[PDB]
Amino acid sequence: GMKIAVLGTGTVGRTMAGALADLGHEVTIGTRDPKATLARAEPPPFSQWLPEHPHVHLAAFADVAAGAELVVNATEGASSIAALTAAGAENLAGKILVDIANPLDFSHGMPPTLNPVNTDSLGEQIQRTFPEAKVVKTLNTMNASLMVDPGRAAGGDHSVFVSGNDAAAKAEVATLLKSLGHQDVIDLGDITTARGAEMLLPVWIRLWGALGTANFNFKIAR
Amino acid sequence: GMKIAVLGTGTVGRTMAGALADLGHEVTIGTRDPKATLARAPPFSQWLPEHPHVHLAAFADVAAGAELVVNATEGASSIAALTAAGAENLAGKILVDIANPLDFSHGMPPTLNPVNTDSLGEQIQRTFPEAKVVKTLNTMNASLMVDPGRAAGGDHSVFVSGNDAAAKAEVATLLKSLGHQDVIDLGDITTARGAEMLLPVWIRLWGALGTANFNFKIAR
Ligand SMILES: NC(=O)c1ccc[n+]([C@@H]2O[C@H](COP(=O)([O-])OP(=O)(O)OC[C@H]3O[C@@H](n4cnc5c(N)ncnc54)[C@H](OP(=O)(O)O)[C@@H]3O)[C@@H](O)[C@H]2O)c1
Ligand SMILES: NC(=O)c1ccc[n+]([C@@H]2O[C@H](COP(=O)([O-])OP(=O)(O)OC[C@H]3O[C@@H](n4cnc5c(N)ncnc54)[C@H](OP(=O)(O)O)[C@@H]3O)[C@@H](O)[C@H]2O)c1
Ligand SMILES: [Cl-]
């Protein structure tokens, strides 16, 4: 197993950290301030989740990234650059950075829109801000539940995408995705293909409304 | 059998016009200038005689006589094509919008304009407020719009976006007649944003898979 740092204490971070730990990886979870995160009483609260996953350990973004071989970005999209900067470019250099964030924009009305979008992407922004990291955009196109148990929606009949400049990095991420139950991994190409992957979110949001559930997924039929 | 006007002489317009004529509809195909179009270089002049029931005429002349109108024009020019068709000829009728507002001004692959906070489907609806705009079929290759069974046995999804639920219901019936068994109503015309925004990944999937013979399926 690998030493994996999951930056994010929300549903995605918890879901991924728990699943990766169950697969035999040594998993740490990154947060801005561990004391503040553990002190949160409002919901569930992170302090109620952590005791159920005894093999997972909490620390600040910089501390978890420095100790990990591979890093997973599961932070709020609008804050991902800030989170990763706090993690430290020096702690990301030469390592695979799995980017699951969506750059949702909740500033000017509902449902959210994307920023950046179309001619740019959060995946690209992360890669050019941290040029020595090996960014792989993946898993952002489905509900957290399906990232680790895709079988819950239509017997696991679905597609997952990878985007990234380093083919060897994408191959390693594909192996991890397969270990999580994803049998159809499609390589969209370089990191600029994160634009199309991120741009699936607007229809995802409308499908959630139209279908009355987040238990659905995209399948590329061919 | 409805009177359908298909605005567009490219692969989408030809494919849709031919399929609808084969289904029993009285189909007309719209172009800017019939004389100029037939004078080109397969060429439209060779396609047209193979579909004798389909009639070619100017945009304004096909829309006036039609009961339902299909937009199959270049996305960047759709507002101009429909303006030429005439707002008076679109009033009270279903306007099926298949166009994608691809933007080729800054190289390849194309991006979208409008995008994100706006869509071509919305632009069309607010420019022609009395038309009943329904965004659909823009998310797949022309071949699959009329014969979806060609890709993975037809296991795919098609979307409808539009403000008028009765208009969407009529379009859903037409889509079913074309072989689309899974029609998903995304909601109002602003949901055309998500439908149009599937194109960037579509373009990369075409490159990644080496074929246009694929489709989106929403598994649930
Ligand atoms: N919800 C889903 O099922 C789903 C599906 C696909 C993709 N995504 C994407 O996955 C990401 C995570 O979503 P989520 O719902 O689990 O959590 P989230 O609420 O979007 O993000 C919470 C995390 O972001 C960090 N964060 C928030 N503001 C920050 C800032 N100012 N500076 C640095 N870090 C900040 C938090 O740090 P602290 O720990 O210190 O609070 C926390 O770790 C998002 O980008 C989302 O769009 C979510
Ligand atoms: N290719 C596909 O399988 C596919 C799939 C899904 C959606 N779409 C969308 O479907 C639409 C049609 O695509 P296409 O490849 O069949 O044809 P296209 O090349 O995009 O469009 C050709 C049509 O647009 C009209 N047009 C071009 N410039 C115009 C202008 N300045 N003013 C008025 N009309 C103008 C042409 O008029 P004339 O007849 O006078 O030349 C012609 O009828 C596009 O929006 C495209 O994005 C295509
Ligand atoms: Cl554990």
d(CA A6, CA A14): 8
Displacement of CA B84 from its chain's centroid (Å): 17
Structure resolution, Å? 1.7
> Which residue in B168, B151, B200 sits closest to A117, CA to CA?
B200
Dihedral sign of CA atoms B74, B153, A201, A76 in order: negative
Give the DSSP letter of residue A184: -
d(CA A41, CA A29): 19
> Which residue in A84, A22, A78 sits closest to A54, CA to CA?
A22
Helices (H), ranges, chain A: 11-22, 34-39, 46-49, 61-67, 80-87, 89-92, 122-129, 144-148, 167-179, 194-198, 201-211
Structure token digits, residue A154: 């239509």
d(CA A134, CA A139): 16
d(CA A3, CA A167): 21
Would you tell me which CATH number, out of the four given (3.40.50.720, 1.10.1070.11, 3.10.20.600, 3.40.366.10), belongs to the domain A1-222?
3.40.50.720
Tell the burial category of B119 from Cβ atoms under 10 Å away from its Cβ (0-12, 13-18, 19+). Answer: buried
Q: Is the CB of B9 under 6 A from ligand 2?
A: yes
**What is the phi/psi pair of residue A220, to 5°?**
-95, 105
Q: Residue B101's CB: how many other CB atoms inside 10 A?
A: 25
3-state secondary structure A34-96: HHHHHHCCCCCCHHHHHHHCCCCEEEEHHHHHHHCCEEEECCCHHHHHHHHHHHCHHHHCCCE
A-chain residues within 8 Å CB-CB of B203?
Answer: 196
Residue ranges at the known binding site of A for NADP(+): 9, 12, 31-32, 40, 75-77, 102, 144
- Phi/psi class of residue A156: alpha, beta or left (left: φ > 0; alpha: ψ in -120 to 50)? left
By C-alpha distance, the chain B residue nearest A118 is: B111
Query: Which residue's structure tokens are 């989106």?
Result: B216
d(CA B105, CA B48): 32
Residues with Cβ < 8 Å from A175, sequence gap 6 or more?
A: none
How far is the centre of ligand 2, averaged over its atoms, from the C-alpha of B204 (Å)?
Answer: 21
d(CA A136, CA A128): 13
d(CA A99, CA A80): 9
Helices (H), ranges, chain B: 11-22, 34-38, 44-47, 59-65, 78-85, 87-90, 120-127, 142-146, 165-177, 192-196, 199-209
> Which residue in B109, B35, B108, B123 sits closest to B78, CA to CA?
B123
- Phi/psi class of residue B103: alpha, beta or left (left: φ > 0; alpha: ψ in -120 to 50)? beta
| Amino acid at residue number B130 | E
> Which residue in B21, B13, B19, B8 sits closest to B150, CA to CA?
B19
| Amino acid at residue number A168 | A
Q: Is the peptide bond before A116 cis (omega within 30 degrees of 0)?
A: yes
> Which residue in B91, B81, B69 sits closest to B17, CA to CA?
B69
Closest ligand 1 atom, residue A76 Cα: 20
Structure token digits, residue A130: 């941290």
* DSSP per-residue codes, B107-121: -SS-EESS-SS--HH
Q: Residue A94's CB: how many other CB atoms inside 10 A?
A: 8
**What is the phi/psi pair of residue B69, to 5°?**
-120, 135
d(CA A175, CA B61): 58
Q: Residue A78's CB: how many other CB atoms inside 10 A?
A: 17
d(CA B14, CA A189): 32
How far is the centre of ligand 3, averaged over its atoms, from the C-alpha of A169 (Å)?
Answer: 26
CATH class of B1-220: alpha beta
Determine, for residues A187 and B208 on separate chains, whether the beta-carbon distance falls below 8 Å: yes
